[PDB]
Design a protein around this nucleic acid. Sequence first.
RNA 1: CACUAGGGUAACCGGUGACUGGGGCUAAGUCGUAACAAGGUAGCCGUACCGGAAGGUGCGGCUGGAAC
RNA 2: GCAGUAAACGAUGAUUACUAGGAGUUUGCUCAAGCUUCACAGCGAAAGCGUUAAGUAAUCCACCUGGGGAG
RNA 3: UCGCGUGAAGGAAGACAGUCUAAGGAUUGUAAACUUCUUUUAUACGGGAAUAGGCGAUACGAGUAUUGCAUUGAAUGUACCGUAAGAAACAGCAUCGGCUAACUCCUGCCAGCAGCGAUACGGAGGAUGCGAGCGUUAUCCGGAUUUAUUGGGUUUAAAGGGUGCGUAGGUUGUUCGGUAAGUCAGCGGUGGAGCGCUCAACGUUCAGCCUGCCGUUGAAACUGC
RNA 4: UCCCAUUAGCUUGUUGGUGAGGUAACGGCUCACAAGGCGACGAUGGGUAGGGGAACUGAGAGGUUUAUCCCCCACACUG
Lengths: 191, 97, 129, 160, 120
Amino acid sequence: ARYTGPKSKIARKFGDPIFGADKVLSKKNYPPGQHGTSEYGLQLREKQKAKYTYGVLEKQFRHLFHRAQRAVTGELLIQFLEARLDNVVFRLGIAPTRSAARQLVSHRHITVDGSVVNIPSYSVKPGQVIGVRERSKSLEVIADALTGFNHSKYPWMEWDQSSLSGKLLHMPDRTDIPENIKEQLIVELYS
Amino acid sequence: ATKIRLQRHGRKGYAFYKIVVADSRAPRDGKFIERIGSYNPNTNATIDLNFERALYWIGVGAQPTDTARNILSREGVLMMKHLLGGVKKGAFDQAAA
Amino acid sequence: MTDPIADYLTRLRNAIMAGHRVVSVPASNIKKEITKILFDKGYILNYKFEENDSQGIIKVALKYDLKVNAIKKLKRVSRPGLRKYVGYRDMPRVLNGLGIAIVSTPRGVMTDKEARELKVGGEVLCYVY
Amino acid sequence: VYNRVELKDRLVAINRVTKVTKGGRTFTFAAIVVVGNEDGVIGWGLGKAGEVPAAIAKGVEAAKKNLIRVPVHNGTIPHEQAASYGGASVFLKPATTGTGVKAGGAMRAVLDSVGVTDVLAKSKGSSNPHNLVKATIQALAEMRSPLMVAQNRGISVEKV
Amino acid sequence: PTIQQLVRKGRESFADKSKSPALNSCPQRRGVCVRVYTTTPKPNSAMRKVARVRLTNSKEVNAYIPGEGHNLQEHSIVLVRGGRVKDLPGVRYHIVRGTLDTAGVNGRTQRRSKYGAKRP
RNA sequence: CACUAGGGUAACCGGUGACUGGGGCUAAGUCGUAACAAGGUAGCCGUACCGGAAGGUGCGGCUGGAAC
RNA sequence: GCAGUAAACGAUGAUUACUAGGAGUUUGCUCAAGCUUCACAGCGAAAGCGUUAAGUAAUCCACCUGGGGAG
RNA sequence: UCGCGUGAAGGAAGACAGUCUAAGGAUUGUAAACUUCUUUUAUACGGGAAUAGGCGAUACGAGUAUUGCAUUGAAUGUACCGUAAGAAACAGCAUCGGCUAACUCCUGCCAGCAGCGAUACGGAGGAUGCGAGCGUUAUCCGGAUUUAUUGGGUUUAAAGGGUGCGUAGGUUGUUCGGUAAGUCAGCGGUGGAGCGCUCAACGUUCAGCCUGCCGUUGAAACUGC
RNA sequence: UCCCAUUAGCUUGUUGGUGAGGUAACGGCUCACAAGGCGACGAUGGGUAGGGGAACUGAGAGGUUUAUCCCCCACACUG
Ligand SMILES: [K+]
Ligand SMILES: [K+]
Ligand SMILES: [K+]
Ligand SMILES: [K+]
Ligand SMILES: [K+]
Ligand SMILES: [Mg+2]
Ligand SMILES: [Mg+2]
Ligand SMILES: [Mg+2]
């Protein structure tokens, strides 16, 4: 399933702008509810923060966690979360937000190594090419997010605008990923 | 009699066969005497085969099925005609073609 | 007596607890081997063997710091009621390698390190650290 | 135990301790506090004051006054150690570098205050906080470094 | 004990009893309401509705009726599950609401699945 | 020769039965006060006899008892 | 001649070896057996035990596994 | 059990609910305005699972051509219009535990425990889990060391027999030699990395244990003889 | 290779020898002297189970259970 609910409530609950920029981040910024903590509370807040910022449900999150444990566990769990089709598409800037990237991947618009992959949880190994569909290179929504913005602030993406593709050089280290997540709390909770 | 046959060891919609030597009375996927290879008809068909053991069993007299006979016709297992010393002593090389 | 090796270990432990400097034991061959192993491994100050009209006496002068003894724990492993036999591939490590285990082997009586070096097993007499 | 006279404070537990008098019941407030700098120095204390903050402050002062030095290396222990205090028994073993602290409660508080990263800890006695923390610190105090073992025994290449 | 004592005798391990022995290792059983009566709790002072039911496994037991308002009566086929009531000696089983003769609680808008009430 | 069938005596496994006795829990309605303080005759163990009832008494033992 | 029970108790099985001091007492002559109370290390949940251990060790036997029902 | 969807980006503080006559929560939530179609529907192309007469010639093997052959089946997949259009529940929010206002009742009730009969009962508003599931019951393991060889105990918590003699059994001071039953060692026999599923569960291959049993050679510190 | 001693003796072709017959084949398998054999390392008798690899589950010790799958055994209303 998917959350498909109100996003500003989660944004005001967690304080951080996980989904992006909004006026409610500065106006009326407090946890939701007309009525609005133990270490269990903070650990649950951290785990739910990761889940909401990456669009992952509980069973998939647990599978990711113990896969990272089998193969610092909290350190590489974050890069496992980052290495996802929707997340990589969003970080390449070709889609505005992670939900938009997930919808674009789920629809027939994104190819991996020349073959269209529409599973928005496909792990992307290093040295792989992710590109827009050749039949969808001329969409009105597909171009304003990539062209014009042109952030390119991540030293593990190669963009190559002349082909509309993209490549992942290697898994970034835990310090270079701009996510305010304490993996020690999550690994302690799941331990 | 002793036979050379294929057991369906795979998944629904993906048939993967194991080439074994087994009695004719045994069940299809049950007991066997020796495993001599694999077979996959889904590709464009990858065949693993123990040449020495297949030759030994076809020499002692195991009767192969039709499909296993075709698999032995490929990979040149039925060269017993050439290896029977048919008024010669050298070994020909037809594998290159 | 039932277990002379256990008696020897107990005498050493009681002397250490009482804070004595020397300890006497009625001598035996395996106990001579054990005290030689202990002296070369550096757990006691020195020893002496006195062959009298009886089976003999072993006099052991213990090792103290400038007032803590060099020996912390002695544990008998293979008792008469339950004998313990092990090979070189399954021999144990005492105090995670900071202690020793005296082992009787067909090549003689030595510690677990020498036994694993020589690839032989036998009886685990005691753990010493 | 080497006394070795900034460390953060951790509150292990508090207790609603009462008294019986002819007039009525008079209630105190006890608290066990452990001070540590995640370096190898840990102390423990018991505050016995009226208010909760006053009890915590008294326990912090007592723990700061009573400190010991625990020999540690990296984030693990040199060897396995078992220690019993009162109705509580504790067992500590070394673990792999990527394992973390596997125990919770008073054991977790004491090991966090001492700074040990990788450890396998198990409690085989009772769940009393006083005796539990005292047994854990006793187990840490009876722990000998490889250098200390080498110095006590003689040569330092004994492990070969 | 000594090693030889253990060799001669050994160790004996008992078997833990089942908290719902009348079910005969079944999740639910079927019965008929032999009697429908009311009992008093052992510091509560309520009037708890209970039914004596003879189950199909040749056993008669007492089953509590949860909720407010029961349409059951004598000689009614009911579904009986495990679960006991703390402040009531005797009874150790519950009657499933909304199954067989037992009807769901009327006017329920919360905890509906525990009392067999459909969505309004 | 034995598969059965038949009679009879013997077991074991089971139901039911005029009538007659323990135990548990819930009520507590009644009757006394045995134990907890030297609990108002110190208490308890064994044994025997005797009582609506808790119990009483005789003989030996113990302190898990005062008090001297 | 039966019976075979007890707070039949040190509420503490037998054997062997080792480990600190004070106060008395009996016998054999300062020494060794025995006999009882304070008391190191140690043990114990504590009261306490402490060379006559409930300390350190080894061998064998007996017994326990929540309370009633129930010896 | 695994995977996917029920939409994606902007839009100020509508009407209707609550808690306080204004303010706060629902709330960027709805309403319109801009795109996308995974998926559903209607149409077309539609694989794979299907491989099996001469020409050497030893006269027959055997190696080479051709022929039909799909229950699944509009089934994968590919492509074409015109549309957010067809698609979210269940549990619990006084402590353990993540999540609190108001109205009822003051018995009806609820509970795994501390218990409340209400920051615990019933509803309304919000909150927190999980999510095509969510809870209840039944069964089995671990925490439990609650049978303790690894790894518990017996003065007073359960637990030393009333005390001995003694059968079977268990244990055996020191030392010199033999043997090889226990023990030890060698040699034989036997029993993570890829690839394909669009991803994953799942299929499949090799590196990797065989550390159980048996045979056959040696060693002699310890136990046994 | 499961429990019960509130299950202590069991067996009379039962143990062995000679000969014969029978069987694919050895053999009390069957048929015509000596007497034995088996048991507190549990005979005998009673109750309950098909047995393994798997599978599940414990750091380990292990344990539970044979739902699908594979190997062996027994059976086809009752003899
Ligand atoms: K093919
Ligand atoms: K009285
Ligand atoms: K009296
Ligand atoms: K007496
Ligand atoms: K004393
Ligand atoms: Mg799912
Ligand atoms: Mg008692
Ligand atoms: Mg006695």
